[PDB]
Structures are given as structure tokens and as C-alpha cells.
Amino acid sequence: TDSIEVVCRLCPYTGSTPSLIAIDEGSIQTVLPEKVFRFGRVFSENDGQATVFERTSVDLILNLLKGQNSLLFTYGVTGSGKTYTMTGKPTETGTGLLPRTLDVIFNSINNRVEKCIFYPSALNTFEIRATLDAHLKRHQMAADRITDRYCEAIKLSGYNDDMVCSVFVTYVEIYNNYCYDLLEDARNGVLTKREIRHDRQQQMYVDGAKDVEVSSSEEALEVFCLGEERRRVSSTLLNKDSSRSHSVFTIKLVMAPRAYETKSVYPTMDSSQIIVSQLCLVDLAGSERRLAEANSINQSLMTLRQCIEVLRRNQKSSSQNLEQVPYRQSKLTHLFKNYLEGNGKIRMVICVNPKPDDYDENMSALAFAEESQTI
């Protein structure tokens, strides 16, 4: 089955004294400047972005097309390649998981409709306008609302051509046990704290977070960059590092049965027929991390560790006699309650720096390993 997988990626290191070395392409050995860790896959400095992306994201996108949910974390110290893995630089050798994922999603879906047909509604739902109403909304929206960049050409199969679809993104930040919508229409010049809660389907969501409709990989990246502008607003109004907070970018594939007897591509009007699947990409705060800020980060990452360990034991246990996931011990873990209770697919990418300076911090990062062996 599709249990949680943890993979590890070494960043480039031009030194003679490494704190860890890759062995089996699925194993890593500790090196004092005494433990061996086993992962589902180990990437070396030679493994480029394209290799990571296919091994890390293609099966999650295939999940998305199947109407199932997926969750991907990047974990590690600052300067570990965590942001490089996730986003990188918009070049052929530099682009990370997120833009390639957006590219492949938009390459692989069919029957993508125009905007304002689907639209977000109360309590984490979507409704459906009639076409002429949506048409004016588009021209109402267009009153509101230069990338030379590498683009992934990969097209995956598996989209349900009996479904019509639209793509919505939410971009959310968890900083100091408070949750913020980086896509909020901020009026006061301050981001509003947001509540993490469930809907009637028991699915977690951010109450007042904005679901932004995007028609292309390009448009989705424009929205992502807008969120990055908000993400850089520190408490002291300086530049806040991505290591200081958790960033949650959720790609939603909103689907509905295609309507017959029309020359257009349009859903059936019954909104209860809507199916929504998620691919959620999370760029965790740096594991090395303003005192309450660092305590929230270590509390949340420690809760995450405990939760995936409970998740692993539950995946081997029976229907009864399975143990509670302590997901309420942090805001971050609460937001992914469904995944940590075994719904959907979770993949964690442990980014580690082989430099001997990051030795002790790699010991905590490699503790996420599926299993461990001692010298």
C-alpha cells in the first residue's frame, strides 16, 4: 500500500571531512568529525532536480488525478538545500518540486474550465455558477487581479475525462503557533491570524484562507510569488527567513461530472457532485531553530516526529488496537490530521548537509528514518 515514505537528499559538499556518507542509495552512515539510517531512497549531490522530482512527486500527481490526497514535506537545517529542493531558481537545472509539479499538473489535466464557474463557498466547499453569470464574473474579476522560466513538458495520464476541473491554490504560513494566509487581501497592512478547523467531511482547512483560482502553471506561480512577498514580512518588518516558519502551498483539483448535450466544456450544475483532491507541499521551518519562535518550531517538529511514528505503527496494526495520533500538540500537525491518521499519501524529504558543522543537526534530521542501525 501507499504508506509514508521518507527520502533523504544530500546537498553539494566540497570538503574532505563529511559528517555523513551515502552507501546503498537507500542508506546513510554517520561520521564523527556511529549510526546507519535507512530511507526509501537516498539522493546524492549528483542527483539533479529532474531526478528528485520524478522520484518524489510524480506518484503524488498521479494520486491527485485519481481524486486522492498527497502531502510532501521538506525537512532539514538552514543551508541544507531544503528551499533549493522545493523551489530553487527558475532555470533548467535549478527549478524545484513545486513549479515542476504545477507544470505537470496543468500538462496532465483535461477539461479545465474557464474561471468563476467553480467558486469557493462557505465552510471549505465549492459551488457552480451558470455560464453567462460566470462570464460576467470573469470580466468583473479581470478588472481586479515577466517569467522567462524553465517549464516541465512531462504529461502524465490518469485524468478522468468524464470530469471537468479547475485548479485552486491556497498558500498558508504557520509561524509561532499562529496560522496566516499569505494570499489574504490584506487591508490594514497586517496579516490576520487564521483558525485551523475541520469541515463537515472532517477534513482540515484554514477558516478564512483564500482559495485562488489559477488557469495555468504560470498563473499559479504568480500567486505563489505573491505569497512569498507576504511570507517575508517579519515581526520587526525586516526579512523573515523561510527557516523561521512553515509554508503550506496546497494545490486543489476541483472536479465535477462533465455535462452532456452541450458543445462546451461545463460541469453538471449539481455542486454536491463536486470532488476535490489535494496535493500539499510543505516547506518546514529549519530544525536548528525570538525565544518563543524557536520553542514553537521545535515543539511542532517534535510533534511531527511523534505523529509519523504513531502513523507507522498504525499502518502495521489491526483495525482495532490502533493508537491515537497526538496531532493536537501543535498547529502544524493539527492541519495535517487527516494525513497523519492515514488518509492520503505522505512523503517526507529530509535535506541534510554533509558538512561536519551540521553533524549534530543531521542526527535529529536522520531520526525521521524508517529504521536505524548502530555501529
Author numbering: 25 to 57, 70 to 181, 188 to 331, 341 to 426
Article excerpt on this structure:
Kinesins are a large family of molecular motor proteins that utilize the energy from ATP hydrolysis to move along microtubules and transport various cellular cargoes. Zen4, MKLP1 (human homologue) and Pavarotti (Drosophila homologue) are kinesin-6 family proteins. They walk to and accumulate at the plus-end of interdigitated microtubules, playing a key role in formation of antiparallel central spindles during cytokinesis in animal cells. The kinesin-6 family proteins have two characteristic features: a long NL and a large insertion in the motor domain.
We crystallized the motor domain of Zen4 (1–441). The final structure was refined to 2.6 Å, with Rwork/Rfree=21%/24%. Interestingly, Zen4 is in the nucleotide-free, apo state. The structure reveals an ion, rather than a nucleotide, is bound by the P-loop (L4 loop). First, the ATPase catalytic site of Zen4 is in an open conformation, with the Switch I region (L9) moving away from the P-loop. Second, the N terminus of Switch II helix (α4) extends two helical turns and moves outward, consistent with enhanced microtubule binding in the apo state. Third, the nucleotide-binding pocket of Zen4 is occluded. In contrast, α6 of Zen4 is partially melted and ends at Phe419 (corresponding to Phe318 in kinesin-1), which is almost one helical turn shorter than the previous structure. The NIS, starting from Glu421, flips backward, forms a five-residue β-strand and becomes disordered after Ile426. The backward flipping of NIS mainly occurs through backbone hydrogen-bond interactions with the N-terminal β1c strand, becoming a part of the N-terminal antiparallel appending β-sheet.
